[PDB]
């Protein structure tokens, strides 16, 4: 039993590091074409060069900054001169500006809206003639387990991750007449590079909140990723799976 | 049992018609004082002075576009001018821009997060001043059942439906140290006058989701709004109340 | 703004004290004709007697223990040479048997789901008859919020507590075109008798998880089962309210 | 990326046919050993030696009547003659005793609470020692859309499969510390040979409920369950993942 994507397109945005990336290397694992896309162009297309000769699949990489609707649909006309179009999109870039409420400006209200939901708005629609011709697709949006339970100087951040669920699930709807299937994975805490920076005594109490005890690794959220790429997952959409370690 | 908000102020944003209205009125009928908004000034100080007549409540109309951010703080200047603060915030302003998603506009789509997500935080922003001071304050957010089941040609909407969520969550996580609660109501169908555009054809449909058979009066969401606002919910915070018939 | 309950009866299940207690007075203090029941009938019939002096409300007290068939049958016969039916059901009364999982015995598991949802099953079917030949019941189905998260030595308490929300939401769906509403209040850490053998150490713990900082008192429990009982609730049902102070 | 199961026994009970059958059969074509388990040995025998042919691995057919603890610790006791222990239980096994609420006897509620939850209780503490010596395993329970949404004629078969989600969320928080992870599955409407006594009539009225438009098939749900068992999902625990194109 085998789960293969040759033959296939996966765009992941926001994949030049952290889960994006591991995301993007799953799916190259598996065979899949790669779009690899980050705020810099060249990040991302140094980024698509290594995962091509890791895995020796076709890979290419794009600017796109996800703060501009110009950049994203001009990404978009970079892409589609490369490929004949997406399969599988991984609407994983998003951003925090944390900020208690009470003092939360504007634009850190804003740009994570902008992003988040916006960005994965417009990312989508520019992603979907591929598949609804062809009636397959899997659109696969990361959300967080605090777009659930809510979290303390996260409400721009939660109120977008918890916005995505609605997303999931309205488009969901209306695609699955024409056989995509639009999904959301949630996952806890992830160990990053990034999970660095973070004091011994900040991260032994977040993973006391962790029943399995420990982080999960990008690679693991990754998998869940390509479970939902895969022919494993035909009859689920609409859906959001949490990948916590039992948190929530 | 008697449920009264004598001396408290609430401001009940989009309520010169339908729930916003009833809202208003349930709140002035317990004896709150009220503040009514509207994109119309005029039309919302001829509300206010209605429901003033009608209840014999101290009541303000105010200007309020939620899509500029020039109005609110107007709007708030003269709240501040008329009251010594607010104890209520009812977040019930919301517009749709009904559109398959593939036919979706990025207006439709911005509009629609600007009004719903971006207004709502700003006016909240707006509110807070005199409910952390007092340690006592009651925000209770309009959601929709459709944020949760999400819904075809509603992704825009749906989306910020499903943000408020995690909107309240994360807002009443932040402040129930200083004993803000923070809730929203989720209502299913309800019969208000833009329904009567509706076929009998099409309401009898959207019937047929309803186990209680029958679409809920504005009054029957005012009346949880009240709840929420009442002392019979002090220990109830960053949680959603569906009042949607059994539909979910 | 009244919540009055004069001419109406309500049988609270587990009612000698506690929670149970709380919510029994707090529907008599509304005007209701109240029907408490325990494992002891003597004990129920001085409860009774005490909020009947109390609040000046008709009150009777029966024996019942959910456990045993029989008795349940007995209680009822009692019940209804005392009053012409039932118009409100609070289904409080449940055990726990806490065990890790894998120290938990045959019995632990089966007496706990026998009480919890076997009794619950039994007395909601014998207190039907008057609500549904009105056209007007509520029927209020305690929970918990562990059979939502999940808790640690309480895997058969979680199930049972997770099982009547499941018997909540059906039960909405099969009534509802009576005009009979179901729903469940799904109460986080209150302070209880019981509460008084923890140690203030254990106690601060759990308040840990608490957002409003507090453990709620039966009182807060209790003004939300009276909300769903009142005509403020009227288009409310299959729904479960959490009552736990911020925590889920 | 293959996810194969070469090595490990599974347990999968009411595995004569159906759902059962299909994920006992979806384990073994990745290579599992299988225990198929039946209310008839002789049929599960049968079966067992089918799926043997037809994938060449090992498998086991025992009888198991989960209305009996006896039954159930005896089969066992075979189980445990044929193999070192279990890796991977699915617990599957289920009945439904349809009846409208106000008319279903004491036995047909108290049955199907005996399956599906105190037999899920019995045979899962009877399956972990294995996992819990080794510190791996995989758990994973058949509950169904309608323990979430609820059901007309089905109070006592919804508050099980609603049960069973606290069933897993609290045994996931147990056995976390040892890496057993314990999630559930919640198909929709699966079409199996008994789909086949259902009117064209009622099964069109059902999948308008269904956005993909069509039942999933017995594959789909083992699809699920498999990922479940693979490295694919080592970060989940406590999950519920809906199996059901869109419905909920």
Redesign the interface.
Same mark, same amino acid.
């Given at each position: 039993?085998?789960? &293969?994507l040759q033959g296939k397109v996966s765009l992941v945005t926001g994949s030049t590091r952290g889960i994006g990336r591991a995301i993007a290397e799953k799916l190259a694992?598996?065979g899949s074409t790669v779009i690899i896309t980050g705020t810099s162009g060249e990040r991302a297309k140094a980024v698509a060069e290594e995962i091509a000769n890791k895995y020796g699949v076709k890979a290419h990489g794009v600017e796109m900054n996800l703060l501009s609707?110009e950049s994203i649909n001009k990404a978009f006309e970079e892409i589609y001169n490369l490929v004949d179009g997406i399969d599988i999109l991984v609407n994983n870039a998003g951003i925090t500006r944390d900020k208690?409420?009470?003092r939360?400006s504007?634009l850190d209200? %804003?740009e994570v809206?902008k992003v988040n #939901?916006?960005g994965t708005?417009?990312v989508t629609?520019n992603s #979907?003639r591929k598949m609804?011709k062809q009636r397959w697709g899997r659109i696969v949006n990361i959300s967080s387990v605090?777009?659930? =339970?809510?979290? @303390?100087?996260?409400?721009?951040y939660?109120? =977008?991750?918890?916005?995505?669920?609605?997303?999931? &699930?309205? #488009?969901? &709807? %209306? #695609?699955?007449?024409r056989?995509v299937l639009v999904n959301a994975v949630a996952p806890?805490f992830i160990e990053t590079d990034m999970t660095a920076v973070l004091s011994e005594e900040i991260k032994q109490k977040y993973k006391e909140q962790?029943?399995?005890?420990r982080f999960?690794?990008p690679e693991? @959220?990754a998998?869940?990723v390509?479970?939902l790429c895969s022919?494993?997952?035909?009859?689920?959409?609409? %859906?959001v799976?949490? @990948?916590?370690?039992?948190?929530?």
């Amino acid at each position: 039993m085998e789960i &293969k994507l040759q033959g296939k397109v996966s765009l992941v945005t926001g994949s030049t590091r952290g889960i994006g990336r591991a995301i993007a290397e799953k799916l190259a694992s598996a065979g899949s074409t790669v779009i690899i896309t980050g705020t810099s162009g060249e990040r991302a297309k140094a980024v698509a060069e290594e995962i091509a000769n890791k895995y020796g699949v076709k890979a290419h990489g794009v600017e796109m900054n996800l703060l501009s609707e110009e950049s994203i649909n001009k990404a978009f006309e970079e892409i589609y001169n490369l490929v004949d179009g997406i399969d599988i999109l991984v609407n994983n870039a998003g951003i925090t500006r944390d900020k208690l409420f009470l003092r939360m400006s504007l634009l850190d209200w %804003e740009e994570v809206l902008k992003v988040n #939901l916006t960005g994965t708005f417009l990312v989508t629609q520019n992603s #979907l003639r591929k598949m609804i011709k062809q009636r397959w697709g899997r659109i696969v949006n990361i959300s967080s387990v605090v777009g659930f =339970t809510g979290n @303390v100087g996260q409400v721009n951040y939660s109120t =977008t991750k918890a916005g995505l669920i609605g997303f999931t &699930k309205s #488009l969901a &709807k %209306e #695609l699955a007449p024409r056989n995509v299937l639009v999904n959301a994975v949630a996952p806890g805490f992830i160990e990053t590079d990034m999970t660095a920076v973070l004091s011994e005594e900040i991260k032994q109490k977040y993973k006391e909140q962790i029943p399995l005890g420990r982080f999960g690794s990008p690679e693991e @959220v990754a998998n869940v990723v390509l479970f939902l790429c895969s022919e494993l997952a035909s009859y689920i959409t609409g %859906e959001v799976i949490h @990948v916590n370690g039992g948190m929530f």
